[PDB]
Symmetry: D3
């Protein structure tokens, strides 16, 4: 239920032994990326989806419809991390990506068990989630390894950020209060990936990283915007 | 998204031209079946699922989780009518089953489109819905044609009966009021199939028909009961 | 306040020493009778009276108006049990009926004390409650002793059944929640009378018993239906 | 069911032709009486009964229990006017009291019809309502005619005064809003009887009038206070 | 926060050592004054201001607007007590008034600190509060010392009286429930001043005292009536 | 009481004739400033103050307490524009600042009239609002004219931006819905001042402008944060 893709302490082995989950430093690429897309994050808060979460009035059909699509996304995201692991020549990143794929596998049992979804091929994605997933797959299979940390960061940081923002706007007895509880708290998975990414920032083009991060943030916005248009 | 599987007037052609959807007569097999399972129907009203619908407090995860499983069930149900048509004892029933399969195809667009489900094989059914679908497939492929009308009747009459019962218990401004609107009103699909069944009443063993209808009703109860157990 | 007409353990004396209040067996006349009237019970749940109880919106004038009439009914019901005791030649039934009259006397203090009602003759019954009470009196004074157990069973079983059904539909903080509390729980009085009746089932015509039980159930429905028509 | 005991225009004939229902003059005995008991009226507003009316949370058993007792009170009140007419000091007052008895008869249809009460003798009054009715019967049968106008005034003015005070405190959609609608508006019955009283003001001892009015007001308070004690 | 102007035990020194805060006797000038203005108090309860307090719907702009004006009033009231102390030749009243001015100073820190108000001259009073304050100042500076106890009594007794009246009408979870809590309880300050005043009742004209008290009560009503007319 | 400080068309005369209030271009200094402080704006949304506005539960004492301080701030702000006009580097800016002072005078009627505040000197500002006003006075009197446009922009854009964000989070029937209505819509005053600023962009140091705008934004945050601490 708790939505996290962090690598747990028990799997911080080998080259990952010293990987930390503390908040990245102010001058990190992680905060540079986030700060640059903050206008998009605010637009996410302005969607009918999140206004419905806070009010308790989100159409249960919109909620469920998006959950199925998020299953599709997460099934593919796990495969993207497996691809990134296969394609990495850097041993630390191979181990990191392999462990991230395992974290996705663990989280994804909610889709298999609670939501009765077998695999991505048994779903028909909407255009926006399909485009988003295809973009991530492109990054995983075609770009340098550290860009995978960039493109996957929005989905790991944005959701807790939204949850922590909406906490004080979502009454504890309201119907979608569970969304806050499942997603909110310290975004340790995001921070952990931010701390991994910082160690490779010299190996990538930061203007490219900005573009990739912004593009993924724009897809998050598209997905949430379209989620409540059931027409 | 009106939940109906009725054969529309435009498709009542050939052998089906004179098939009516008026309420079956009091002495029909249709009412004999329904009246004998009324204790089960009352227990469906006592499930946490329907108490949640009426109060507007059903967990959206329960609602969605069950909807995915109903997609599985309806995808299979369509295939069962295709099987029954292939096995049909006469041309009238072949046409009836083909028309029912098409009505399922039309309704099933909601599962493909709104719920993003491709096909039954891409879902992992829970035990109760799997057992139910397997039972319907057994009837379609192994028993005489008229028993298909019997086994498929509960899902066509029960849901409207529940909606119509709960209408006065479910406030018009409540979150799951849509359930009443989409399922309630005159159960013309059920009446239509009861009227078809009545024409083959002399062709079947009424005690076996009761057993089959009661089994399907019991599965509806089991499915609705298990729907809110997300453990 | 707790609405029960059971004979308490302290008055299970003499021939009644061994009378049990456990649930009657599945093959009992008690369940045969109930199962046969279940459609009527469902119609009772569809009345504006019970929809108002569950919603907390029942007009307090309708509530009170029916309570006065129920005082009339219960005053007469006590007298009917006294009649049945007088008219019984079977010693066990004489003792049973005498004890039931005493249970009615005890319950009826709520009408004398809380509702300020002196006796039936000081009230003007509505047509439906008058007809119902006259029917019970006819059974008591004109038919064989065991039919008195039949005709009085609906009022003892239906109300707890309704309360137990509506429990999960009636919020604990709503205005008529007390109705659930006063009437719900194990229907021990009904079961006890069912266990008495079973011992005489060989002495009556079961088709007649069905008719009597169904008629009383139909009166319950009439009374509840008319309760909210204050025009 | 507008609660009024006013003599309608159609019955203002003979000696009553010119009787007005305009607000009594500031210097009238009517206002002298009312103003002197205003502390009691304020205490009626502080009862649990009226706090329940305003909040919509008055126990329906308290509402109904008191209504039965008000039936007792009004059945007797009608008889008191009949007595006062028999004892009347002059023809004008005979006609006034007869007209008031008929207004009670008209209003009392609500007790016979909606509340199913036959007559006072079929009710068991609580202590406070019994004491109050006995006091009114004492005035009607033992004191000079004009004092009847004095003792019966509280029940005609207080209830509208309470309704009009609570109007702005009782939401239009609340369960006991009907109380405001049925009792509020212009207290024309009270004004009418005040205007009759004023014509006999020189015939009575104003200190005795104050004692009598204050006693009746104190009984209204005691009745409303005890109404919610269902112990 | 607790709105009291009582002199605390620690400042009951000198001539004030024996001053009590128990309820004044029934025959006191205090109750004579209050009883005579009770109709005005009831009109205060009928204002849109208090209907808004009880309902939780009072416009926060009306609430705040009046609070600023009450700061003005209380700033001036403190000065009035200082004037009364200066102008008193009776040593007990000098000490009393001096201590009352100190109680006002203590209460008035809420206006300085929470409401950011420096002094009366920095505010622009509405007509009604200005007239009220000017009347009090006239009494303080131009009439015999004991009349100061008379004119200041309404503001000390009326507010707790209103709070204690509205307690049972103001839900504990409603937005202005704090008003009840801050103002309600035993009106010890009012009683204390009533007990002081009783010792000088022989030294003033009680018809004049009535006029002064009634005039101040009428100003309270004017102030509350105008508070919600922001046009 | 629409909160706007825009110069109305009737006062766009002389040098101001062609001043527009259209949205500034994407490359303007206006948007550069705003975009750089967006993290602060998001933190304003996270204050207890705005969570209270959206929920309708903001303590009316917090609302009013802050309103008094905003009066202080606006009284001073008007004086700051008067100072800036006296110090103006050219005639166009002299006219602009004079027009802005008049717009403040017009708006400030709400503080004089509804809130009964005479002038800044009659208020005791809290620390944060004092610091903020002192900073604006420093800019007006000590720095080059165009920086006045920079420091005063946050209070003109932030409030509408907040209102427009919270519109979909604040129910139309909620107690502080008026806040959305009075502050929201098109921020034409802010756009107008941004368009004036843009004409002097070559006259200022953009890094200093960012520092100044960021300081004012940080003060808005501090003020809103401290507003609900009534300790």
């Amino acid at each position: 239920r708790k939505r996290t893709f962090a690598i747990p302490a028990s799997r911080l082995t080998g080259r990952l032994t010293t990987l930390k989950s503390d908040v990245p430093a102010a001058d990190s690429l992680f905060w540079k990326l986030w700060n640059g897309s903050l206008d998009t994050a605010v637009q996410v808060l302005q969607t009918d989806y999140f206004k419905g979460i806070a009010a308790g009035t989100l159409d249960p059909n919109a909620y469920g419809s998006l959950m199925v699509q998020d299953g599709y996304y997460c099934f593919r995201g796990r495969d993207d991390y497996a691809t990134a692991a296969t394609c990495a020549q850097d041993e630390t990143l191979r181990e990191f990506f392999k462990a991230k794929a395992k974290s996705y596998d663990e989280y994804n049992e909610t889709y298999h068990q609670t939501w009765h979804l077998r695999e991505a091929s048994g779903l028909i994605p909407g255009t926006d989630i399909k485009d988003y997933a295809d973009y991530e797959a492109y990054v995983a299979g075609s770009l340098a390894s550290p860009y995978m940390c960039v493109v996957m960061l929005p989905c790991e940081y944005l959701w807790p950020w939204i949850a922590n923002f909406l906490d004080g706007y979502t009454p504890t007895n309201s119907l979608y209060r569970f969304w806050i509880e499942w997603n909110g708290g310290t975004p340790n998975g995001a921070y952990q990936m931010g701390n991994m990414l910082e160690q490779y920032r010299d190996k990538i083009d930061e203007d490219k990283a900005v573009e990739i991060f912004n593009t993924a943030m724009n897809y998050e916005l598209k997905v949430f915007t379209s989620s409540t248009i059931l027409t």
